[PDB]
Point group: D2
Chain length 282, copies 4
């Protein structure tokens, strides 16, 4: 099942697309639907026609419906340094340290209102001169840390603020439009192997491919199971929590996002998440 | 006005104590009440008798009412290094850097469910061997960053995890029972000068004063106004958000909290926040 | 316990006055409070001062609070001919028939929005030229037909429409402002004997006692228990349903209510219900 | 548009069938949907497949969905004597009087919880020995008395209690299962002429047509407009109120309903409402 959500005249409607391309209008809240599916693959709803999923992906809005975040994740957390000047501890950089350590990096990324969806704008802080998108596989979780599904997430990061001081990381990570995900959440059975997926990032500036890069999830060294373990340790998470699993695609120092850029992130078996960029004003 | 809240048979009742010791049962949600008071000092409710505020402070529960968090803060944020081995950038420690920099440290501390109140237990992570309480003046904020009142907050911190790597700060800060506040929120007019208040920390172990230390808020170098400025920059906060303003009372490396410790924090004009300690099990 | 309710800035607050004149602000919905009291005489709430009950009775509104219906009764039903030209069946009038029959008269009187309280206006239909108040003891009921308390009710009746044809009774009984009750609901233990209470009706026109009459409930022939029996037979009623028990005070044909009349109804141990009259315009 | 509603795992879903047999799952509450349609014929929702409307009509439940009341009418009112021993006024029967009078009969019939829908059981009072169904055209109304649509209603009537005394009419009319309607509500444009419709009643006893009778609405003498006029006079009604417009099909005194009877009522352009009968136990 691949779950998406539209906003229509101020209210939400959730839909699921099945492998045979049939679309079901959901009876339940999408997080509840994902929990149910995780249990027995049951889906409550009616088959609908006239919902053009492919058009929604490309054009964002058809008539009075517009695609958005597939769920409202009560919490969003991130991991980093999970794939194969700077602050340093006894001559060794903090990033190299975490890479070699038993304990992975886990940080709080966003509340639901700080997240945006497919076709909506991500933001660059007014006081950042070097913000990069971070293209990542993300998991939707229940309160036990069980994986309810997979999605694409952009961990939008003010890399300059982070480089300035690791103590500025929260400021570099948490703000309005700091986070984007979708366009769908795919159930766990839609991804046979999460560690064999292609991730492609494109930054499009005035029609021009200003940056393009790809990585396969077979390069992830710090596994998701371990990330979840450290996330939930002494730390309860609500159903529908999203954990984003780090990035291996890092544009250069001259590749900072600017106003009206288009960020496109593709992941195998999920789709392509597309977000315009808005630079915040001082 | 000094605002407190009790839980009674599973529901909440908010009360305000006035300077003349009269107690008012509030008609409105306490955050809404604080916003109203900030505007015109109006308080909606009835004067009650038989609510023994002083007893609630000392004994926590009287009959079927128990004092708790005075509000549910939708977000809790913290600042650090605000008062007059380690990771370092060009030989200078990250903490010294922030101290000397224009940009203060701002971090996400807690969601409301990770916070506890007067008489309830704070927690030490199962994987921390050195957790300290951090006694702080905290402010309750509206969405514009206007100060709606003051309270005592304990920023419970796994100092060992932080010392290990600054990238572990979120893990050291955010978990069940990582945060305590109260026992009251005092309106802004109850504190003539926020920069002239005594803060006293006591850690009581089996009746013994295991640690005691005090500092005056006249030692705060990074002002609250500036902390709020950087908190809300490109970053919307909900009404009732709490910002805790850093600490200057830091017990030694041998003063780590353990199970059944009692942490007591006193601030002038607010009161004394008292929380037992629970060590989490692996 | 004697229960009343005020409206304040668009919201409700319920209060109970105890025999010793102490006033309690209720934690629960008043119907729920009455059900609880019926079980074990427990009352959840705080003692309040500054609520001037006697003034509310006389002046209706003090400051920003105004007395109203003590509850929202989900259904209101009436009985008639319960105390010691016309349509007739085999020469015997329909009213004489019911009086002598095993089956009492039971009719639907009002929905909560068609009822008014102490100090609010009752109405005379635009097409009635002879409307009388009918002063009655009324009972508040749970879904099992158990008596939760007693109150005063005015069954406002377009007597001319009724006299015209018994088939017009619903029209004569059910309309906006057709029904008034209060000013309090008294718990069952406040009335030792429901069949030993004085009921007094006064219609005041421009300061003049235009009508006055009284009857004692010892003249009720059709008992309340029996009225309840026939009400609930094959007919579920919600908690807080009010059943009004008929009248023995019947003003003459020249005593029809008009605009700005004041109707006052006193019942022993309950109080005096006072309602101005508004004549509806065509 | 023809609107129906199903109950599914304890929740409701509303659907509309269009003239071309396409079925739309409604976004809005059905009363709200009817109000919108009355304004500009707009219908908010998605076209669904796999909802077998014809099967629902015949079999009542398909899989986990069951047809029910198409709306919850906040109030149900009735009119009688609207088509072309006893109590009498000056030798003339009360029924003949209303027939010849300017003022029609209007009575309160049911609350929503006393109503049932297609495929659900109507009831015969435990104390009635002669209960008849009364097959009627009914209208759904907004608060201004505007007709939002038409439906079939069964005004289930304890005719023996009524004959006993006109003052027993409420008891004969108002009780659990006293009222049935559906299976659909048709919008006003689905009925070109409400006064040219065939109404057919069948009472089926153990497979046998125990009674059959029909009448056309061209025999209605007291028009619906006039019934609505007297209903709403000084008497506010909520949106979705149902007014049932009287009957001309009256089975004989030996045709009283009994347990397990099937009552079927057909009206042109609406459909056939089918309800089993349950005799209530003493």
């Amino acid at each position: 099942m691949k779950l998406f959500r539209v906003v229509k005249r101020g209210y939400y409607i959730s839909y699921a697309i099945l492998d045979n391309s049939t679309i079901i209008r959901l009876d339940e809240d999408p997080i509840k639907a994902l929990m149910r599916y995780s249990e027995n693959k049951e889906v409550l709803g009616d088959r609908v026609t006239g919902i053009d999923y492919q058009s929604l992906l490309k054009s964002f809005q058809i008539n009075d419906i517009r695609i958005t975040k597939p769920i409202d994740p009560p919490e969003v957390w991130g991991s980093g340094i999970s794939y194969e000047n700077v602050a340093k501890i006894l001559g060794k950089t903090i990033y190299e340290k975490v890479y070699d350590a038993v304990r992975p990096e886990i940080f709080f990324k966003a509340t639901p209102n700080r997240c945006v969806g497919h076709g909506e704008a991500i933001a660059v802080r007014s006081d950042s001169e070097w913000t990069l998108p971070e293209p990542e596989l993300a998991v939707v979780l229940d309160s036990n840390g069980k994986i309810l599904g997979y999605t694409i997430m952009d961990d939008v990061s003010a890399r300059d603020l982070e480089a300035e001081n690791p103590l500025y990381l929260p400021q570099s990570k948490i703000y309005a439009g700091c986070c984007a995900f979708g366009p769908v959440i795919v159930t766990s059975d839609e991804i046979k192997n999460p560690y064999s997926l292609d991730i492609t990032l494109k930054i499009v500036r005035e029609g021009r491919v200003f940056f393009e890069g790809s990585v396969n999830t077979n390069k992830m060294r710090r596994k998701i199971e371990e990330q979840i373990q450290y996330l939930i340790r002494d730390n309860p998470i609500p159903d529908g929590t999203i954990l984003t699993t780090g990035t291996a695609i890092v544009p250069g120092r001259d590749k900072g996002l600017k106003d009206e850029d288009i960020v496109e992130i593709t992941i195998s078996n999920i789709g392509t998440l597309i977000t315009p960029v808005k630079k915040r004003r001082k």
